[PDB]
Amino acid sequence: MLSFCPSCNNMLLITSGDSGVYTLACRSCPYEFPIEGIEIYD
């Protein structure tokens, strides 16, 4: 989906949250996301 984190600005990968929730966080640095993710390519 090619997203990025403020500050460090590397990449955002989807990680499985415990018990039912699906989240995403930047690797090696603390962060979390509200989801509602979307992408479209033609």
């Binding site: 090619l2 990025f4 460090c8 600005n9 590397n10 990449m11 990968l13 690797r27 090696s28 390519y41």
Partner: protein, 765 residues
């Protein structure tokens, strides 16, 4: 007759060719060699230091060729003739000056001869330089001899001009199936090394090398190249928009999932996966083994002390290949002269001479080590007399190498065969024809027709006629009448000047940028990245044409691929022409009348900014006219003498344009097989095989080229009448008919001279 504009243009070539002779190559390079190269090579190692004894050191202050004291030269250096008759070589002694120091605490000097060395004909150190008439009659030899050849051990051989692929430059090729490949080669001093970038699959790209074992994930390499932030990377090799994102995003994705950052895993990865360690002084082992690696591995050309320079360069190297991965075309094929560079013998002799000198060192160092390990009486000398009998290894070593054609190097370790060729003497053309000829190396391909057929870029820089029809076709070419081979100037005094012209250092520049205009490349290296290309180009060319850095260092714009190139790297062909300012020529009549009458000679027009040399890929950017009549004032340059397109050997044929190319090609091969009177000294000369003519005559129809090359002074053939009719019947297909009593008064009467050699030896008995 008044002076017109369509006349004096032809008078320009004799003024140009009278200063610089028909053969520049061998002469000019050998002259630069014996002065610049000799003083530089000896400066590389000026000292020999061995371990034993309290202190010993030896320094070579100066090295010269056959010149010292009040003596202008050797008392008598054997002439070319006598040297050829006695089978002796042609050489001049090498004078060296060294400073010896013993444990007797001394500092002293001397002048010694380390050995001999071959000297080429028509050189500054020869006896034939600037000599006229009776001087030649006394020295028993011909004034019209071309010169520029080495005579050793009886007969004489010639070092042939060898073509080489582009050195220290990026070249990108595309392929069916697997993908796109770019190759990078260079040499720094002792070693030569090649880098190969490759995309195997997925769009994710790999780096192959003989140093590192297997195919690194470059996105990790770039982390080891000093950059961390990711998307800065993407915004560099890809940048703003369109489809360049998703392709490189694949590698970007899976590279940072398993192992991600610029420091920790970056260096350690490469270091653990790296090949043989060379076994000595090896263990610093840490992230620091990759430090030395990351500095010098493949891209070592840039190097220095930072990670920023090399990084962006590799990134920009990734920039181009992902563009041609998108769609076909958009590449650089390796065919035409623009990507090719030729190297004169001047560099090759230096490579061969420095190897034998290096071999002498360690042997000479170990020579004194004998008595050094011996208990008593420390020795002052025998680093003189004993190394003199140990000398001459350079003599025979260099003489065997030049006579054989097999060069043995312990540094680059490149063994090259088929370099030197024996000069074939039949007619006067064959001697001048074999010289000024371009050879080629490697590339194989007897099957491939790619590097065979002629290409439009060859025009004016090479002969489009001459070619040795046979097994080898198009693999050997010839230079035109007016050409100049580029030397090397310097590096440092460009950048600093370029910075003054408004360009800025790449370090301070934030790199998000494919976006602002072009950028300035120095020998392929991105430096300035400056806006406003117009004022940059024009003013730079003005500083060239007028007061500074003439000839090479030419600048050309690149429209599609966004950049502006400045190349100072020499070893390439240059051609002269005339600048047209505004709507009309810069020459303008009376200036040329001032020339032909009494004065002004040549090379003065360069000072006045009239005639100059285009070159490289800059010849593509410019616009060249044909005739002064044809001018439409959109034109940057006109051309002087359009008939110079053909070579010197092909200038014999009358009305060449009336015929077809296959006919002119055959004559170039047969024309050198004709039998002439050769030289004046011919009767006093003993050859191995020679054919003579009795009553030679000039052609009834001459050419403008044959006068400048001095042909009709020594013509080959018999001028005779003829009739076109069907007669005989012994004629028919491709067979002529002669006439007796025309032949009985003689016609084309020949003579055949051969020789025989015997030697009376003495055994051990």
């Amino acid at each position: 007759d008044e002076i017109n504009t369509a006349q004096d243009k032809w008078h320009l070539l004799p003024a140009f060719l009278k200063v610089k002779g028909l053969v520049k190559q061998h002469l000019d390079s050998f002259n630069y060699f014996v002065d610049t190269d000799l003083k530089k090579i000896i400066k590389a190692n000026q000292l020999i230091l061995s371990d034993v004894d309290p202190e010993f050191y030896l320094k070579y202050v100066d090295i010269r060729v056959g010149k010292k004291s009040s003596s202008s030269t050797k008392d008598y250096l054997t002439p070319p003739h006598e040297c050829r008759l006695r089978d002796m070589t042609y050489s001049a002694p090498i004078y060296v000056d060294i400073e010896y120091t013993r444990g007797r605490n001394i500092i002293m000097h001397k002048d010694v001869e380390i050995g001999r060395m071959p000297i080429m004909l028509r050189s500054n150190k020869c006896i034939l330089y600037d000599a006229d008439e009776s001087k030649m009659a006394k020295l028993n030899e011909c004034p019209l001899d071309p010169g520029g050849y080495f005579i050793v051990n009886g007969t004489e051989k010639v070092i042939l001009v060898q073509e080489q692929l582009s050195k220290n430059r990026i070249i990108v090729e595309a392929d069916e199936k697997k993908g796109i490949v770019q190759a990078s080669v260079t040499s720094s001093t002792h070693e030569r090394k090649s880098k190969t970038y490759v995309i195997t699959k997925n769009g994710k790209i790999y780096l192959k090398h003989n140093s590192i074992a297997e195919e690194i994930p470059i996105a990790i390499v770039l982390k080891a190249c000093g950059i961390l932030s990711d998307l800065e990377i993407m915004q560099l090799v890809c940048g703003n928009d369109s489809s360049y994102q998703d392709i490189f995003a694949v590698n970007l994705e899976e590279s940072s999932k398993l192992d991600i950052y610029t420091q920790q895993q970056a260096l350690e990865y490469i270091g653990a996966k790296v090949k043989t360690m060379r076994r000595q002084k090896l263990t610093i082992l840490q992230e620091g083994i990759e430090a030395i690696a990351t500095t010098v591995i493949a891209h070592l050309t840039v190097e220095a002390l930072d990670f920023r320079e090399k990084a962006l360069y590799i990134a920009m190297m990734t920039r181009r290949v992902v563009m041609a991965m998108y769609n076909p075309k958009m590449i650089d094929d390796r065919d035409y002269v623009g990507n090719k560079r030729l190297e004169l013998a001047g560099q090759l002799i230096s490579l061969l001479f420095e190897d034998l000198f290096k071999k002498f060192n360690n042997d000479f160092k170990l020579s004194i080590d004998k008595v050094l390990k011996k208990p008593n009486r420390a020795m002052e000398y025998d680093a003189l007399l004993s190394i003199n009998v140990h000398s001459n290894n350079i003599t025979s070593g260099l003489n065997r190498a030049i006579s054989t054609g097999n060069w043995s190097l312990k540094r680059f370790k490149m063994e090259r065969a088929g370099v030197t060729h024996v000069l074939s003497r039949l007619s006067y053309i064959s001697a001048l024809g074999m010289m000024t000829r371009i050879s080629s190396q490697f590339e194989k391909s007897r099957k491939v027709s790619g590097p065979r057929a002629l290409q439009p870029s060859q025009f004016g820089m090479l002969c489009t006629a001459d070619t040795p029809e046979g097994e080898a076709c198009g693999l050997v070419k010839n230079l035109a009448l007016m050409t100049h081979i580029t030397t090397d100037d310097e590096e440092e005094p460009i950048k600093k000047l370029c910075y003054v012209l408004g360009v800025e250092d790449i370090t301070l520049i934030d790199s998000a940028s494919l976006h602002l205009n072009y950028g300035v490349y120095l020998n392929g290296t991105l430096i300035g990245s400056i806006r406003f290309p117009t004022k940059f180009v024009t003013q730079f060319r003005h500083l060239r044409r007028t007061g500074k850095v003439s000839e090479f260092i030419s600048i050309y714009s690149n429209s599609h691929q966004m950049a502006v190139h400045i190349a100072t790297d020499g070893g390439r062909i240059c051609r002269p022409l005339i600048i047209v300012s505004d709507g009309q020529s810069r020459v303008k009549d009376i200036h040329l009348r001032k020339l032909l009458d009494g004065e002004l000679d040549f090379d003065d027009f360069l000072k006045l900014g009239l005639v100059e040399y285009l070159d490289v890929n800059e010849e593509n950017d410019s616009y060249i006219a044909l005739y002064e009549k044809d001018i439409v004032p959109s034109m940057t340059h006109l051309e002087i003498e359009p008939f110079t397109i053909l070579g010197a050997v092909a200038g014999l044929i009358p009305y060449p344009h009336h015929n077809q190319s296959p006919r002119n090609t055959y004559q170039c091969a047969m024309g050198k097989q004709a039998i002439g009177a050769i030289a004046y000294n011919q009767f006093k000369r003993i050859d191995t095989l020679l054919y003579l003519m009795t009553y030679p005559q000039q052609p009834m129809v001459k050419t403008k080229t044959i006068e400048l090359i001095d042909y009709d002074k020594l013509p080959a053939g018999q001028n005779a009448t003829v009739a076109v009719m069907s007669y005989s019947g012994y004629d028919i297909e491709d067979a002529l008919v002669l006439n007796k009593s025309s032949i009985d008064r003689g016609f084309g009467r020949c003579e055949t001279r051969r020789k025989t050699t015997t030697v009376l030896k003495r055994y051990a008995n």
